[PDB]
Amino acid sequence: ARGPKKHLKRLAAPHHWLLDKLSGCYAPRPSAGPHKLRESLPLIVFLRNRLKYALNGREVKAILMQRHVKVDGKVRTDTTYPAGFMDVITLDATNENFRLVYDVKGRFAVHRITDEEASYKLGKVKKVQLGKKGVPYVVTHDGRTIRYPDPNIKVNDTVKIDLASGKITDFIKFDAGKLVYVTGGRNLGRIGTIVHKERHDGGFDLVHIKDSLDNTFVTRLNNVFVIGEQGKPYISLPKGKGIKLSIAEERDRRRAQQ
Amino acid sequence: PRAPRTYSKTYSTPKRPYESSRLDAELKLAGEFGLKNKKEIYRISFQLSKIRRAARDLLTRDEKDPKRLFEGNALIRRLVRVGVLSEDKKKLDYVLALKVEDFLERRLQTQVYKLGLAKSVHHARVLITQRHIAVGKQIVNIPSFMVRLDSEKHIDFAPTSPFGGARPGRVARRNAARKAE
Amino acid sequence: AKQRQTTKSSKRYRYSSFKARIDDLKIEPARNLEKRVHDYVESSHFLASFDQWKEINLSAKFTEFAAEIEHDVQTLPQILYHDKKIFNSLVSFINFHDEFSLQPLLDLLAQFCHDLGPDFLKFYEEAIKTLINLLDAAIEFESSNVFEWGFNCLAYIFKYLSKFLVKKLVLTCDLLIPLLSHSKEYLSRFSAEALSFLVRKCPVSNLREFVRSVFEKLETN
Amino acid sequence: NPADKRRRLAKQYLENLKSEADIIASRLKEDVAEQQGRVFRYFGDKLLISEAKQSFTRVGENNLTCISCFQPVLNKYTFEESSNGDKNKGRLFAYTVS
Amino acid sequence: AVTIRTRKVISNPLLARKQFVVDVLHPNRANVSKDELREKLAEVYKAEKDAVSVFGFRTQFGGGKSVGFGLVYNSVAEAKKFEPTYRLVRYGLAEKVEKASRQQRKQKKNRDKKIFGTGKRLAKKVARRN
RNA sequence: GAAACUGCGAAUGGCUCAUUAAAUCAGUUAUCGUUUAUUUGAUAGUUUACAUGGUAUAACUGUGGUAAUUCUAGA
Ligand SMILES: [Mg+2]
Ligand SMILES: [Mg+2]
Ligand SMILES: [Mg+2]
Ligand SMILES: [Mg+2]
Ligand SMILES: [Mg+2]
Ligand SMILES: [Mg+2]
Ligand SMILES: [Mg+2]
Ligand SMILES: [Mg+2]
Ligand SMILES: [Mg+2]
């Protein structure tokens, strides 16, 4: 190609969006934004294929141009705006606030939250560095740069960002015993507690995570997101609480509730 | 272009179509079940072979294997639901003991014959293809329709059928009109 | 400006300024001939509109208002017996000035007066005072729809209480003087239309008193 | 305006309840409870089975097969009794077959 | 008799409407045209007919029942604002815009691409030349 | 609101497999070895002003050339 691509085939789209393979030939290409293309949910999919509020792309555009959707407290009018992990989506006219959190299956789940919970979000500290004029700043996972961070904040820590003012309220250090959320790999969407962090200089660090059921799994550090201390998450969790459950029991409880 | 839509063949030609004993076997199956052609027999045989090969592969696995337990249980549930496998025989070994006749009886044609709605298997076929038979509240015109245990008690003449309480067909009212005239 | 949007474009969606909407807006409910929910009633106007608004509006304030008043509005006699608490709740929620919930509340307030007109007279002064505060509050936050809801509700109350208000229209005018004399041209303009309906309905004898009083007042905006 | 008419009927109906006496509020719910298809006559506990005055009246006809009873009822919508005629005001009838 | 049952009802104040799936039982009848379904739905939900849209109706094999999708806008103006133009034309609320076939418009576009400016100067130039 | 100037796009998409045998490509690395429109977040009291020019032109008015073109000359 002689330049950046602008089209996305449905088969090539991220699997977790759950798009019909025969509905059309192309899928919404997320525009540039806070989150990466493969780890983002465009607003069109959320409003049409998840909430079912709109029946087609044009109706989604009509909703957006009416300025009823807010992302992180800001109005967005792009159909393919890349909303992502820990993103707050507010619909005032319908009066709901949603937090984009993966389910156990590995898919963004429609999780409704209260207003007081919608007032803040969490961000994994991807980078800390001194800017121009000797002003420290922190870059989070969603591309937010916050100046004058607390000196104790380091990489791999989590910062509680208030949406209205965009300032850090609290933070969590990355240490053993902390509650973590998996954001990648086939363990995507699971929740557990840190046990040990294995370090390899010049390589990818590995973290051992133990679930509430005592099952243990190892994951690369890049896919780990600290969300609080054990038993005290700073955000409301989706149904299932990030516990992976086998297939036989899946049959079992589906029958039981049925 | 749009993504492909998958397709598959539902029947396979036999290893040796020319065995005299075989030819007599399809003669029996077609004659007793009123099958139009040999392709129906081959289709049922192919489905049965797939089922029993899966059962054999599951048996080869060690007992208590999660894959074995899950998949064998699913297969037994499906076979019980369609009715080929009786309730008291819920083990993978008896699945290997199934026969083509078991599936053939569950065909809507044969069931219609047994229930007494038709005087011949061919009469059952013509009744089904002419939209006179309804399972539950819905009309089925396909002789190859497989009946479930729950569906078995709901087979009846369709509401729209002249035999099911609707007005007489075209021939009857035509004859009545000419007689009146 | 001076060449107003006389020639409309082919665009289906067009931007309109608040002043543009206000200039085009006019307070006269009767000219609107669209089918109204309250026209068809089984128990009461209030109940007929109350169920409908539950279907359309999902605002938090309205939902809270509905739950408090749901049990006491099932029947017209129940509304009459519990009229005091119903009016207090309606006034309480309107004062919050939540635009998401104003439309169902303002409509129900008019329909409330429709059910028990002569009984609403004891509520009349508070109802008008609540609207005046709302319309004054509406100036701070731009929403033309809020003005349309408020004044139509005022117009509706006049229509249902047309007989009683006409007898003492000078009192009704006295309440609306801040609106009629308000600095904004449109707020005075809208109020004038609402009060105009009462005037055209007046007996000549009652009118002569009203015209004398206003001329006495005439002796800002 | 028919709403005024309902108000008049409601007003007269309200005056009746005041003669019948919280109490007014509950009784208001009860009268319309026929519209809402739910049980609204909770009187089982207060009932007195033991003191029931029982009687058996012999009849000539054989194998009395069914009985139908007619009860005039005040209608809340129009506040008039269901009696066919003025002579039948508050007269209870029972019909029997054999 | 004909019965209309509404299922999977959703309230979309974003678009200011109510969505649902309409199931229509019509024994002894071929089917129900969109007009009667619209007037019955309008009566049931107490709205103006112009505010009711219905489409996508399929009668199952064997007849006797149909399934489609139905929309009820909160008022007529919003229906005009959001409803697709073609559905408006179906209901007669809007008039079909008459336009030339795509090939004619494309050919005209190309011919106008060839000319530069208003083109009157070329007209007078060729008039004087000939 | 035609025309024209201005801004953006036209480097996406669609088609074909000619060349290509550690080349392409698959998996897996690196940029402490570099560019990056756009989106998103930060970020600039230190630079006649009740606001400067044609150092200028299109569209447009008008005069024309060529057999001919999405050609264009002078004013
Ligand atoms: Mg490194
Ligand atoms: Mg037929
Ligand atoms: Mg240009
Ligand atoms: Mg080649
Ligand atoms: Mg070579
Ligand atoms: Mg190599
Ligand atoms: Mg751009
Ligand atoms: Mg920027
Ligand atoms: Mg020049």
Side-chain angles (χ1 to χ4, degrees), chain D residues 36-48:
Chain D
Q36 306 180 358
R38 289 187 262 87
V39 174
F40 65 89
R41 307 194 76 201
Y42 295 95
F43 55 80
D45 54 355
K46 187 203 169 163
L47 183 63
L48 267 65

Side-chain angles (χ1 to χ4, degrees), chain A residues 148-159:
Chain A
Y148 298 117
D150 185 331
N152 302 315
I153 289 165
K154 300 297 175 187
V155 177
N156 308 326
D157 298 346
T158 297
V159 298

